[PDB]
Amino acid sequence: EHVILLNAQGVPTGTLEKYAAHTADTRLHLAFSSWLFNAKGQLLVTRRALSKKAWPGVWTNSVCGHPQLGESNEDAVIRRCRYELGVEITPPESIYPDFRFRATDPSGIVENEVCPVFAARTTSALQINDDEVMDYQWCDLADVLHGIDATPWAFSPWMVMQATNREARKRLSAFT
Amino acid sequence: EHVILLNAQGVPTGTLEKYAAHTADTRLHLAFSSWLFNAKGQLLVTRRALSKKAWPGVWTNSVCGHPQLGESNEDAVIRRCRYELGVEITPPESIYPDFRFRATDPSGIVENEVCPVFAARTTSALQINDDEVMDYQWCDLADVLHGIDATPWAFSPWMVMQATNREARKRLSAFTQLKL
Ligand SMILES: [Mg+2]
Ligand SMILES: [Mg+2]
Ligand SMILES: [Mn+2]
Ligand SMILES: [Mn+2]
């Protein structure tokens, strides 16, 4: 598996092995962020496994990953939903297409990404991959936003940035 | 290190090795919890290190631990603040002396404790011990209480139980005043 390196503009210039790519000096690459709701309109929040190289054990939005060469974002979302959560989803829809960020985790591991954000509904039960997810919670989008707004440090920095973007919060809010 | 064992009552029965004590069954033993506030009245929230046997990588109140043989709970509090946080504190105040809690952690480690809770002010800068604490934040208590209300699952369960005890919460509130 790989990440796609991106030049100044977001042109793909090459690839790196996924694990080797995330260091204290992580270079800009392509990724996605996804927010999953069930038929009832509850938001899935997940906790990353303690073995994740970047932000292990951190509570975050439903699913995140790295599109591979030639893979659409939508497909990468579908792929990681199946891989991390064994869950089928409706066609992902765009909720924050220009999201980009750089952050440093507590051990100094950096994420540095162009990271369009999506939402979708699950259409099957979860089946948890414990190599990726150590815990999760179905909740009210309203309570999660209240938590993000009160103690954003309790959550991943990108979850926070996405949830506090005016328009993205609007589009997520209509998912209930 | 070890832990002090208590019977079905809160009466000491003996001691047990620390690590060895905390497993998927763990016997009742003595512990402490403390909530630390800086001069400004901000609350120190900390994140347990990934290597912690129990609740690794979990956000929680400032410090918790186990008094050792011959030690007073307050001395225990003082020692762990120094060990984990490198920080000096004012005499710890008892804010929830009867708090008890049994709980299973995400990987099945059980904590079964008599755990009096304290509050104190820090009197020195922090020197975080990365073997024990992987992240920390100075925050407004009000904010922390809002997050705990909104997403309680995002924090250690003992942090939440203590925070929602009315009497404990009022003592936490008293420590938000600015002091010089
Ligand atoms: Mg992922
Ligand atoms: Mg401790
Ligand atoms: Mn990445
Ligand atoms: Mn214990």
Key words describing this protein structure:
homodimer, 176 residues, alpha+beta, Nucleoside Triphosphate Pyrophosphohydrolase, binds magnesium ion, binds manganese (II) ion, Idi_bact (chain B), NUDIX_hydrolase-like_dom_sf (chain B), isoprene biosynthesis (chain B), magnesium ion binding (chain B), manganese (chain B)
Q: What's the overall geometry of chain A?
A: globular
Order of helices and strands of chain A: EEHEEEEEHEEEEEHHH
Bin the helical content of chain A: 10-25%
Helices and strands of chain A: which structural class? Answer: alpha+beta
Roughly how many Å is the radius of gyration of chain A?
Answer: 15 Å
What is the CATH topology descriptor of chain A?
Answer: Nucleoside Triphosphate Pyrophosphohydrolase
CA distance, first residue to last residue of chain A = 34 Å
Biggest sheet descriptor of chain A:
4 strands, mixed
CATH superfamily of chain A: Nucleoside Triphosphate Pyrophosphohydrolase
Provide the list of bound ligands, each named once: magnesium ion, manganese (II) ion
Give the C-level CATH assignment of chain A: Alpha Beta
Strand content of chain A: 25-35%
By DSSP, the count of extended strands of chain A is 12
CATH architectural grouping of chain A: Alpha-Beta Complex
PDB class: isomerase
Keywords: mutant, Isomerase
Assembly: dimeric
Entry title: Y104F mutant of type 1 isopentenylpyrophosphate-dimethylallylpyrophosphate isomerase
